[PDB]
Ligand binder design. Structure first.
Ligand SMILES: O=P(O)(O)O[C@H]1[C@H](OP(=O)(O)O)[C@@H](OP(=O)(O)O)[C@H](OP(=O)(O)O)[C@@H](OP(=O)(O)O)[C@H]1OP(=O)(O)O
Lengths: 214, 73, 218, 29, 244, 218
């Protein structure tokens, strides 16, 4: 309780970041009480973005130990994250909201498995817009989302393949290719797209073999 | 016309389509309202058709007239 | 005691050490062994893929065999995906080249968690491939393994009527191999004891059993 | 009312509440 | 008989134009309708206290409880406002005041609200301490919780929460406030008297959160779903505050 | 101004007429802000349906402002004070530009005063309990490096800690250092922290502020 009070009320964010980072999974049975969750809910709405990331990771991890406390705040935070994605047209806020959504979907798999449809619609409509941070961010989020929900993303793997091959092959810019390759391999081990993209996209095997020599 | 074999074939398809189960909410509400009287009237008319006696048809027509007067309002 | 004398800086040594760690439920060391065997194979792969794809298929089949162990990890960890990968493995096997030498080792890496008696759709195709490739005795061994009893010892006792596709393939193999007369009587007996079975099967909801049996009787 | 009772009932497909009335929001074990 | 005798008593609610007597005075047609509503409500909340009514009304076929939830998902503001009183009186919950704002009806369902028994003449401090201070028993069975858990599980199995979400969105404000408070009370009762497997996936609310996060629907439904989720969070804060 | 709520079926196109001619730095914004104020007074509660489409441009006024004395920001904040309870689902992306406005030491002083005053006045219809740590730390950053913004920041702090009950008792030794360092005395803040530290009653501490606003409106 003294550590949570210090991590809430300290002026400089370094001690707050150290306190919010030092409360790892060894305190999972003791942070899931009433007052500790009430302190972490204060830690969610912080000024700086890294402590917001860390507190939403801790709370998304803790949300299955005591769901009756954490469910309404997480519903409100998920709606706030999607509203920051679509409505506000600033690239920095969209990048931070995609990163926060990826942290929530990496730390809480069971809760967002029924919320796959509008989140994936928002991320796909953000990928179809007319810094490379937002791109590798949303690739990491969509890879973790493909890993969480299997066989319900078969209605989305075609558009994801057409997008991620145009970002992989014929790279007009020097973007991150490793995260795209990991994301491409992550949605074929969950959906089961095994032999069909070899003939639906006849240049896939060639550009997969070219990466070994260049 | 005193045609019992005419009214029987008139209202037997209605009993036929009523015993295959209600499929909507309106049919379920109609069943919950009138289905007991429309079953007992069919039982009385079957008892009349087995052993011919107008004493069994009068009660069936009593139930039918009660259902008709409740529907017509 | 055989694996410890294999050199560890080669690809097959790291592969056998990975499956050795995977057998005794060590999910962290086996992952790093697989990941090191990846680049130990990738060296020879990029050395061989510069000529042609048909020259590099011999390393691609080994890379596909190596990347299928993580699905064995998911099989031994996640119980709800156990059917799903068991589908896509079959869906991945229909793209490989039909050669018994690589099919044997692919099935051997696949048989780390899947016994032949729970996935028989994959072993009947392997037996048919062994029969078409002239290696009929391995097809016979797989058919008697999938059946459960060897009918070549009891020549007068009938064939096991349960698992009908397996005894159908066994009667086809018996007609093809040596005996053209006894397989005829065996198929007649199979026909009568199987049309004797569908009469007592009054299926009202499960409709995926009558039509496949109709297919088999045709 | 005891842990052994709920464990017996779980084998016969009958669930039970595993918390007491002491706390309003009990952490799931 | 099977499905036509006992299920007659929920016929004023399931049939929108219900005529009980064939020959009645046409001058009294609204008071007769309110009398039918009151008597059918008393009969419905009297069959759910007996086991032979609970089992016979929640049969796995086309029962009389699914016809009660199915007519709740139909935008008829006379049956929909009368079924909520039955749902409030079945679960022994206090009724809020008839208003259009959530913050006024939330205050009327406060467990620490003033009552006439707490005056100095009747029941000065002891009757107030009975209400606001909790009981000393922390391991007694409390069979009322068993009955309410059975009724709540039987109602959730036939899809009551989806119907309550549909009443919350596609209706008037007078009914949306009452259905939001009813959903808040049921969600609070779920994490209190239900087992963990019954109540670990109820608080997610997929049909409401997928409506509050979909930007393809018209914006009124999305905004009223977001407002409903905010009111549910406010009700949860009010419940975790406690009586003062 | 003449049709109060009957402007709704042609409201949406009005919004896309405003999103096309709201260029960043011209003289056209001063009438767009007055049009926004008149639309807010006309609709009165239903404005939240048409609030998000006008949300990005406002943000682009808050950071990319090269007006003399930042008067367009002051007009936009005076237009924001009329929103009332409409920015309930949109306070998460409209409050960080305002709390970023009074802690910046290079901003003009009336703009920071307007930002502190709109944060002070927006708590009479909204719940600012969740966004406590995003406001407590800039205000104590506004108090130790600005000798002129002391009274307005203390009034904003008092209006914020009136909503928070015993949830502010952890912040008191953090603010007390800055208060005794510069000898800052505020009478309403002293009343509130006296009722917070030492008890007044049990029912008034930790109370929903919307409940209090509703019970005092009647
Ligand atoms: O080689 P055949 O003796 O003519 O038998 C074939 C063969 O199946 P088997 O070799 O496993 O018995 C076909 O499969 P392939 O080996 O040619 O790929 C199979 O077709 P499927 O691929 O659809 O299984 C076909 O069955 P069908 O007659 O439906 O085409 C079947 O023929 P029979 O079973 O009649 O001998």
């Amino acid at each position: 309780s003294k550590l949570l009070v210090v991590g809430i009320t300290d002026p400089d964010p370094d001690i707050r970041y150290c306190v919010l980072a030092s409360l790892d999974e060894r305190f999972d049975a003791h942070l899931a009480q009433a007052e500790n969750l009430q302190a972490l809910f204060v830690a969610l709405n912080d000024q700086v973005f890294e402590i917001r990331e860390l507190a939403i990771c801790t709370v998304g991890r803790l949300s299955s130990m005591n769901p009756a406390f954490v469910m309404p705040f997480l519903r409100k935070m998920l709606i706030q994250i999607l509203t920051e994605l679509e409505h506000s047209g600033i690239g920095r806020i969209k990048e931070q909201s995609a990163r926060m959504l990826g942290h929530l979907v990496s730390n809480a798999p069971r809760l967002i498995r029924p919320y796959m449809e509008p989140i994936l619609k928002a991320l796909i409509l953000k990928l179809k817009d007319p810094n490379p941070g937002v791109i590798n961010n949303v690739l990491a989020t969509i890879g973790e989302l493909a890993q969480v929900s299997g066989l319900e993303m078969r209605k989305w793997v075609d558009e994801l393949f057409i997008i991620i091959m145009d970002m992989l092959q014929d790279s007009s810019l020097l973007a991150k290719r490793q995260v795209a390759l990991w994301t491409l391999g992550q949605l074929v081990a969950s959906t089961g797209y095994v032999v069909e993209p070899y003939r639906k996209y006849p240049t896939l095997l060639e550009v997969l073999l070219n990466f070994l020599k260049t | 016309e005193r045609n019992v074999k005419g009214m029987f074939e008139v209202l037997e398809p209605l009993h036929a389509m009523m015993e295959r189960g209600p499929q909507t909410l309106k049919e379920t509400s109609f069943n919950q309202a009138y289905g007991r009287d429309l079953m007992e009237a069919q039982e009385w008319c079957r008892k009349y058709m087995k052993s011919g006696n107008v004493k069994d048809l009068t009660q069936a027509w009593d139930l039918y007239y009660h259902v008709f007067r409740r529907i017509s309002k | 005691e055989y694996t410890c004398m294999i050199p560890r800086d080669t690809h097959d040594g790291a592969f056998y050490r990975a499956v050795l760690a995977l057998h005794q439920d060590l999910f962290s060391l086996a992952q790093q062994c697989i990941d090191k065997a990846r680049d130990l194979l990738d060296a020879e792969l990029t050395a061989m893929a510069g000529e042609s794809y048909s020259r590099a298929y011999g390393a691609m089949v080994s890379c596909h065999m190596l990347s299928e162990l993580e699905e064995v990890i998911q099989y031994k960890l996640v119980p709800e995906r156990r059917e799903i990968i068991r589908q896509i493995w079959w869906e991945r096997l229909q793209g490989c080249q039909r050669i018994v030498e690589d099919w044997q080792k692919i099935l051997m890496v696949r048989s780390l968690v899947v016994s032949p008696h729970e996935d028989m759709r994959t072993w009947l195709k392997y037996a048919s491939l062994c029969g078409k490739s002239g290696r009929l005795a391995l097809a016979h061994k797989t058919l008697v393994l999938l059946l459960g009893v060897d009918p070549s010892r009891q020549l007068d006792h009938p064939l096991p009527t349960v698992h009908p596709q397996v005894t159908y393939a066994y009667m086809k193999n018996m007609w093809k191999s040596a005996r053209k007369i006894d397989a005829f009587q065996h198929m007649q007996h199979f026909v009568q004891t199987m049309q004797q079975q569908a009469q007592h099967a009054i299926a009202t909801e499960d409709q995926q059993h009558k039509q496949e049996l109709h297919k088999l009787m045709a | 009312k005891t842990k052994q009772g709920c464990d017996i009932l779980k084998c016969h497909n009958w669930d039970a509440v595993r918390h007491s009335r002491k706390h309003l929001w009990p952490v799931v074990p | 008989r099977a499905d036509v005798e006992l299920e007659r008593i929920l016929a004023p609610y399931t049939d929108f134009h219900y005529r009980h007597s064939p020959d009645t005075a046409e001058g009294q047609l609204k008071e007769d309708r309110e009398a039918r509503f009151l008597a059918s409500k008393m009969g419905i909340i009297a069959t759910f206290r007996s086991w032979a009514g609970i089992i016979n009304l929640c049969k796995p076929g086309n029962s009389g409880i699914q016809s009660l939830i199915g007519v709740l998902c139909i935008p008829n503001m006379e049956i929909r406002r009368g079924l909520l009183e039955v749902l409030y009186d079945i679960f022994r919950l206090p009724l809020p005041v008839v208003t259009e704002e959530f913050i006024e009806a939330l205050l009327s369902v406060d467990p620490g609200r003033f009552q006439d028994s707490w005056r100095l003449s009747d029941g000065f401090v002891a009757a107030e301490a009975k209400t606001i201070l909790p009981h000393r028993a922390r391991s007694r069975p409390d069979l009322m919780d068993n009955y309410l858990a059975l009724i709540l599980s039987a109602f959730i199995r036939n899809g009551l929460l989806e119907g309550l979400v549909e009443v919350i969105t596609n209706s008037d404000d007078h009914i949306s406030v009452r259905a939001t408070i009813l959903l808040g009370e049921l969600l609070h009762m779920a994490n209190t008297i239900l087992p963990h497997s019954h109540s670990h996936h109820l608080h997610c609310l997929p049909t409401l959160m997928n409506m509050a996060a979909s930007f393809d629907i018209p914006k009124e439904k999305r905004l009223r779903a977001s407002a409903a989720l905010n009111c549910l969070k406010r009700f949860h804060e009010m419940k975790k505050r406690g009586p003062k | 101004s003449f049709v109060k709520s009957h402007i709704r079926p042609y409201m949406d196109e009005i919004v896309t007429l405003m999103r096309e001619f709201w260029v960043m730095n011209t003289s056209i914004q001063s009438t767009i802000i007055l049009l926004i104020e008149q639309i807010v007074v006309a609709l009165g509660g239903e404005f939240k349906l048409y609030l998000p489409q006008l949300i990005p441009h406002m943000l682009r006024v808050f950071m990319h402002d090269n007006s003399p004395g930042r008067i367009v920001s002051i007009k936009l904040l005076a237009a924001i004070q009329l929103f009332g309870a409409n920015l309930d689902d949109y306070l998460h992306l409209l409050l960080p530009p305002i709390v970023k406005l009074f802690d910046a030491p290079e901003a003009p002083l009336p703009s920071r005063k307007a930002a502190l005053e709109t944060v002070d006045r927006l708590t009479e219809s909204l719940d600012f309990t969740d966004y406590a740590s995003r406001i407590i730390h800039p205000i104590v950053r506004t108090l130790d490096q600005s000798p002129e913004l002391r009274s307005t920041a203390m009034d904003t702090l008092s209006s914020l800690v009136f909503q928070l009950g015993k949830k502010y008792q952890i912040f008191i030794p953090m603010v007390n250092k800055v208060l005794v360092r510069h000898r800052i005395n505020h009478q309403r803040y002293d009343v509130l922290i006296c009722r917070i530290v030492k008890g007044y009653t049990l029912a008034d501490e930790e109370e929903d502020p919307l409940i209090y606003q509703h019970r005092m409106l009647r």
